[PDB]
Design an enzyme around this catalytic site. Structure first.
Site, mmCIF file in Angstrom:
data_model
loop_
_atom_site.group_PDB
_atom_site.id
_atom_site.type_symbol
_atom_site.label_atom_id
_atom_site.label_comp_id
_atom_site.label_asym_id
_atom_site.label_seq_id
_atom_site.Cartn_x
_atom_site.Cartn_y
_atom_site.Cartn_z
ATOM 1 N N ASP B 211 -10.132 2.395 -14.546
ATOM 2 C CA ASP B 211 -10.549 3.680 -15.079
ATOM 3 C C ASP B 211 -9.839 3.984 -16.393
ATOM 4 O O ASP B 211 -10.443 4.522 -17.324
ATOM 5 C CB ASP B 211 -10.274 4.768 -14.043
ATOM 6 C CG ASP B 211 -11.078 4.577 -12.756
ATOM 7 O OD1 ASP B 211 -12.221 4.073 -12.778
ATOM 8 O OD2 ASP B 211 -10.564 4.943 -11.710
ATOM 9 N N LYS B 243 -12.206 8.156 -0.473
ATOM 10 C CA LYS B 243 -12.451 9.056 -1.598
ATOM 11 C C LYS B 243 -12.565 10.485 -1.124
ATOM 12 O O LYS B 243 -11.889 11.359 -1.689
ATOM 13 C CB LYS B 243 -13.666 8.598 -2.401
ATOM 14 C CG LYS B 243 -13.306 7.503 -3.407
ATOM 15 C CD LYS B 243 -14.478 6.596 -3.641
ATOM 16 C CE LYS B 243 -14.182 5.563 -4.717
ATOM 17 N NZ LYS B 243 -14.630 5.953 -6.039
ATOM 18 N N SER B 248 -8.930 8.533 -5.866
ATOM 19 C CA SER B 248 -9.423 9.119 -7.078
ATOM 20 C C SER B 248 -10.017 8.106 -8.035
ATOM 21 O O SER B 248 -10.645 8.527 -9.020
ATOM 22 C CB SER B 248 -8.297 9.866 -7.807
ATOM 23 O OG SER B 248 -7.255 8.968 -8.177
ATOM 24 N N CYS B 249 -9.861 6.800 -7.786
ATOM 25 C CA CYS B 249 -10.552 5.836 -8.635
ATOM 26 C C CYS B 249 -12.033 6.194 -8.706
ATOM 27 O O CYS B 249 -12.633 6.645 -7.718
ATOM 28 C CB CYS B 249 -10.308 4.389 -8.178
ATOM 29 S SG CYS B 249 -11.111 3.860 -6.646
ATOM 30 N N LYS B 250 -12.580 6.041 -9.923
ATOM 31 C CA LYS B 250 -13.833 6.649 -10.354
ATOM 32 C C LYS B 250 -15.081 5.876 -9.956
ATOM 33 O O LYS B 250 -16.164 6.479 -9.869
ATOM 34 C CB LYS B 250 -13.892 6.758 -11.895
ATOM 35 C CG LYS B 250 -12.769 7.528 -12.616
ATOM 36 C CD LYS B 250 -12.589 8.901 -12.024
ATOM 37 C CE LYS B 250 -11.459 9.654 -12.724
ATOM 38 N NZ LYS B 250 -11.098 10.917 -11.961
#
Ligand code: GTQ
Ligand code: GTQ
Ligand code: GTQ
Ligand code: ZN
Ligand code: ZN
Lengths: 337, 334, 334, 321
Positions: B211, B243, B248-250
Site C-alpha cells: 500500500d 479486515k 487495514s491493508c487496502k
C-alpha cells in the site's frame, strides 16, 4: 464483475414469430418467455444485461439460420434481410449491442461481398455461421469452407480483420437417427451434442486454411466443442501418424490454438472445465459468453461473477479479451448499472 | 523451448570454497560438484544454458549470503565485495548473464544506497535478499523489512523500478533450536524455506508495504512458498473476518498477487502444481527458474520443455514475462 | 447431499466465559454469536445440521484448549473434565453427535490412559490435539510427539485403532514474540495455523512415527496445511537429496499420504484447491469438514453440496470415508 | 508399475490392407495373440490384457446369418488362441447385435464355455437391405439382452465404429486426414451412451456396467453441460430417467485411457469421473505399449489412484486372479 461481454447471443426474425415459438416449445419449458426473448432486441434483453453485469453482447442469427436453406437465391436474400434487420434494430445502442454477419455460404465470393457490405456499412464484428451450408436440389448435400475455392472468402475475413464464429447446426443424418435423437431427449440446443463443428474446425486446420490465412480468427463455443479434451489425441494424430504420411499443415495443433482459435464459455458454466482449459488453451484465448436465450443470464453471470480465480484472467475472460478482439467502444461500460 | 529465462540462480565467492564445500555436504549428494559449479560463472554455467535451452540467467549470491552476517560493517563489506565481484565476472556475457544486487539489510538507508549504486553502475536487474537479516550481538535477532522504517528503502526500490526477490534462508539460533533441530531433515526446501518467505511476504502484505509502495514488485520462488495453496483460505480470512476486525491493508490477497507479487518455478518442477497456479495466480505472473545448482538444469529444463500446456502461457512463463519484467533485450538462441 | 459427516467441529466449556469471548473476538465479526454457537452442543448445532444436509459431526474441544496449559496437573484436570463433559452432553443424540478425546500431552503414558479410558467407556472416535503441548514452568516450551518416547502413546492409538486429529494452535512464547507479534494478522487461519501443523506432521514423517506405528491414522484439516502444494517438492528433496544424506523414513511422502494421512476440507472451501488435491492426495483420503463455528454451516455445505464433481468421490469425501475411518454405525441419513 | 491391466486391445482374424506408418508392424501385431503381444506385456509391466475383435467387425455386417456366423467364428477362435495363457490373456465376446435374444445366447455361450470377460460391441449394428439402417440397443426389446449381461455380471464395452457414410462427408474426411482410428473423431459412442441413460437402460438394469474408451469420448469434458441438460432443461420438460448423469457415471459407466495418454486430461477426469471408474487401456496395436506404459508408469499422481487405474479397478470389475 461489471461490464462483461458475451458473443454467442441469438435473435430471430419477428415475421417468424410462430415458427419460433413452436421450436421454443420443443427445447425448454416456458416457450412463451423464450420466444419473446429471442425476438426482443432492446427491452428484456438489455434489462437482463443491466441486472447481471453485462455491458455488451454481440448478437447472431439463431441456428440453423441461413445454413439450413439449400436454394442459393433464397439463402442470400435471408442473409441480407437479417443483416439489414439487425443493423437497424441495434443502431441506437452501440455501447451495448454489436452484431455478427449472417451469411449465405453457398458461394465464396457472394459470402465475402455480403460480409464486406455489412462490416463496412454496419460495423458488424465478424461472422457467425452455423457449420456447413445445406445445399443440393432438395438440401441433401453440404458445402464445406476449407477447399481452395474458399480462399477468396478467408482473405476478405482477414482483410476486414474480424473473427469468424463457427456455431453448431442440427446434423442432417438418417431418418432413423433423427427419430432416435428426438425420442431420446438428446437433440437440439443448447447441448448440440451431435454437432459437427469440432470435426469441421479440425478440417480447417488439416486443410491448411490457417497456413494460407495465418491471421484468421475462428471462435468456438462450448469451451472449444470438446477439442481441448482431445488436445493430446489430436496432437498425437498430427505429429505421430498423419504428418508422417503426408499431412502438410505447417504448425502443431497447439500453435494453431495460440494463433487462430478462441473458445467461449457458451453454455458451459463449469469451473472445473474452465480451469482445465486454462491449461490447454489459456486465459488469453477464452471468451465469456452465455448462449442466451437458450441459457439465461442468471446461470451464466452468477457462475462467472463468482469464479474464484486470479484477477487478471477473470478480467481477460470476462471482458478485456473481447474488448480488444472486437474493437469495442471506449467507455462502452458507462451505459449499464 | 529455447530462450528460457531463469532468475533464482546462485553463485558463491571463490575465496569461500572451503566452507562453501562443507555446507554443501548437507544439501548435495556430490558437494564437490556443487562447489565447483556454484563457484563457476562463465564456463560450466553457460554451457549448461546452451544445452538446455536457457538464453539468460540472472545470478544471485547464494544463501544465507549477507543475511547470515550479523555485524553491520562486516555485512555491508561482503555485499560490496559480492556486487563488484559479480558485475565484473559477468561483464563479457551481457546477452547470457545478469545479476541481482546483494545487500546488507541491517540499515534501510545503507541498503538503499548500495542498491542504487549497483543498479546504476552495473545495471543489475533488482535485489535478491535471503529472507530476514541476522542481527544482534550473536546474530539471533531478525530484521524483517515490513516495518515503517523500511519505507525509505522501498521507495528507492520503486524509484529504480526494479523487482526484489525474497529468497529463503536457513533457520538459525533460537528459532532453529526450538523447532527444526529436532527434525532437521525439514530444513530447507522440504519446509523451512517456504515457512520463512511466506511469513515475510505476508508480513509485507498485511503491514501495508504494498500500500505504501504500490509499484513494488516482489518475486517468490518455489511457486509461491505455499501461499497459492491457501489463496481461497487467506482471502476468506482477510476479507470476511480480519479486515472487519482491524486489518487495514487496502487490497485483497488476490489483488496483491495481480499487481505486486511474482512466483517462479524454482525447485518445483510439478506440472500439477503449476496447473493449479494457472488458476490461482495466472500465467502472466509465473516465471521459469531453476535454483541452480541445488537443482540441475536437466531436471528443470527437461520438465519445462515438455509441458503440455497452451503455447501462449508456455512462452510467457518460460521467457516473455521475464523479458518484460526485467526489460531484457530481445535475444534468441542457438 | 444428505448425510454429510464433519469432524473438525469445536465446542467450549460453558464455565470458560473469558477464554470463549476472547478467542471469539479474534475469529468472528460477531463474537456474541460465536460464543453462543461454540457453547451449544444440542440445539443450534443440530438445527444447522438438519438444514444443511449433515448427518453426523464429531466434536472436539476448542483450541488452544489443553495444549495451551503448561501446568501438567492443571492440563490433565482440564482434559478429563472436558472428556467427561462432552460424553454427557452428546448422550441424547448418538445418531448425530460423536466426540474426539481431549488430552493433556505432557506425558505419553498419562495421555495414553486418558485416550484409552474415554475411547473404551464413552465410544470416542479418536483424539484431536491442538499441535504442540505448551510446557515449562513459564509456558515457553513446546512438546512435539514425534520422538520415540511417544511410542507408548502411538501404540495405544493403534491398538484402539482410532485416528488422531492434529489441529493448529496459536503460536506462543518466544516464537510468537519473534515471528508473529509484529505481523499478528497472520496468526491463525492465514498462515501460522498451517505452519505449526505442517512442521509437526512432517516431523512425524521424518522422525519415523509412521514407521514405528504403521497403522496410525493422522488427520490434518485445511486440506493438508500447505503440504499437498509441495508434494512434488517435498518428494524430490526427500528421495533425491535428504535420503542419500541420512533421512531414514522408509516410505515416500506419497506413501505416507496413502497409508497414514488424511486431509479435511475444514475452513478451505476452495473448489480449485480441492481439485488439485484429488490428484496429489486422492479422494480416498479426503474428508469433508466445516470448522464450525469459526466457519458457518451454510458456507461449508452450499459449497460442498454444489460441487460439480463425480458422485463416487462426492459420496466418499462427504460421508463414506468418515463412515469407514471412524467406524460409524447407520446414523442419521447415512 | 507392474501388473497393469489393459482391456481395449484388438486382434483380427488371420484370414483377413495397409493403413498406417511402417504398416508391416501393425498387420503382424494385430493378428498375433501369443508371441508379439505377450513379449511386450513382459517388457512394459502389463500383467494381463483382455483382447477384443478389431472394429468395425461384426457391427459392420448387416446380414443376420452372416453376422451371427462371424461372431461365433471369432469367439471360438480367440478362446482357443489364448487357451495356453489364461493368467495373462482374457477376451471379450464378439456379438451380432441384430437380435437381442440371439446376442444374449452367444454372450451366454462364450462367457459360460470360455470364460470371456464381457462383451465389446462397435457402436450400432449395421442392418437392413444393403446396410443403410442401424440397430440401437436402448429400447425395451433389448431388456432380455441386458438382463443376460447383468446376470452373467460382466461389463459391456461400447467401442467406436466407422461413422455413417454420405459420399461427400466420407470423401471430405478422407482428403482432410480426419478419417478412421485411432482418432475416430466422428464417433457416435458419446450420443449412444447418453441414449442408454435417457431411454432408461440403466433404470431398467441398475447393475449393468458399460465401459467407454478414449477417457469417455469427451463426455467428461461435457459432464457439466449434460447434467445441466438433464436436470435444468429436459427433466423439467418431461424427461423421466430416475438419476442424474453423474449418478449413472458413478454406478454404471467406466472410462479407459485407450489412445489418450494425457496427464492433464486424466487429472481432469479424477474430478469429472473419479479414479474408481477409470481403467488403464492402450488401444493396442493402433497404439503401442511403450507410449502407453511409459506414460502410465511415470504418472506423478497419488499412489492409491495410480494402482486403482493401473490394475486394481480392473482386477475387481473383471474378477481377475
Ligand atoms: O441442433 C442444433 O445444434 C441447434 C443449435 C441451436 O443453437 C439452435 C437450433 C439447433 O437445431
Ligand atoms: O432439430 C430437430 O429436428 C429437433 C426436433 C425436436 O423434436 C426437438 C428439438 C430439435 O432440435
Ligand atoms: O536448496 C538448498 O538446500 C539451499 C540451501 C542454502 O543454504 C541456500 C539455498 C538453497 O537453495
Ligand atoms: Zn446461440
Ligand atoms: Zn536459491
Amino acid at each position: 464483475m461489471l461490464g462483461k461481454v458475451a458473443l454467442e447471443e441469438a435473435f430471430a426474425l419477428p415475421r417468424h414469430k410462430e415458427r419460433t415459438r413452436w421450436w421454443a416449445g420443443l427445447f425448454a419449458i416456458d416457450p412463451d418467455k423464450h420466444a419473446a426473448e429471442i425476438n426482443d432486441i432492446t427491452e428484456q434483453r438489455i434489462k437482463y444485461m443491466n441486472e447481471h453485469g453485462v455491458g455488451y453482447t454481440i448478437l447472431s442469427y439463431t441456428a440453423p439460420g441461413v445454413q439450413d436453406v439449400w436454394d442459393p437465391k433464397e439463402a442470400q436474400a435471408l442473409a441480407v434481410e437479417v443483416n439489414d434487420y439487425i443493423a437497424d434494430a441495434i443502431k441506437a445502442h452501440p455501447d451495448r449491442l454489436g452484431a455478427f454477419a449472417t451469411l449465405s455460404m453457398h458461394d465464396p465470393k457472394e459470402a465475402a461481398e455480403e460480409l464486406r457490405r455489412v462490416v463496412t456499412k454496419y460495423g458488424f464484428k465478424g461472422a457467425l455461421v452455423n457449420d456447413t451450408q445445406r445445399a443440393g436440389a432438395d438440401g441433401d448435400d453440404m458445402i464445406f469452407y476449407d477447399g481452395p475455392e474458399w480462399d477468396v472468402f478467408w482473405s476478405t475475413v482477414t482483410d476486414l480483420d474480424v473473427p469468424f464464429y463457427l456455431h453448431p447446426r442440427n446434423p442432417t443424418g438418417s431418418i432413423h437417427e433423427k427419430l432416435w435423437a428426438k425420442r431420446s431427449w438428446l437433440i437440439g440446443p443448447p447441448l448440440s451434442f451431435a454437432q459437427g463443428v469440432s470435426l469441421h474446425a479440425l478440417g480447417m486446420v488439416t486443410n491448411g486454411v490457417f497456413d494460407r490465412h495465418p491471421k484468421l480468427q475462428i471462435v468456438l463455443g462450448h469451451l472449444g466443442e470438446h477439442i481441448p479434451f482431445d488436445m493430446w489425441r489430436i496432437n498425437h494424430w498430427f505429429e505421430d501418424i498423419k504428418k508422417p504420411l503426408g499431412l502438410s499443415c505447417k504448425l502443431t495443433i497447439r500453435e494453431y490454438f495460440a494463433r487462430n482459435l478462441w473458445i467461449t464459455t457458451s453454455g458451459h458454466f463449469s469451473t472445473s472445465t474452465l480451469q482445465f482449459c486454462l491449461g490447454e488453451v489459456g486465459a488469453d484465448r477464452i471468451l465469456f459468453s452465455i448462449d442466451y436465450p437458450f441459457e439465461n443470464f442468471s446461470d451464466a453471470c452468477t457462475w462467472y461473477d463468482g469464479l474464484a480465480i486470479n484477477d487478471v484472467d477473470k478480467r481477460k475472460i470476462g471482458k478485456d479479451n473481447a474488448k480488444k478482439l472486437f474493437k469495442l467502444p471506449q467507455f462502452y461500460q458507462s451505459e449499464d448499472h
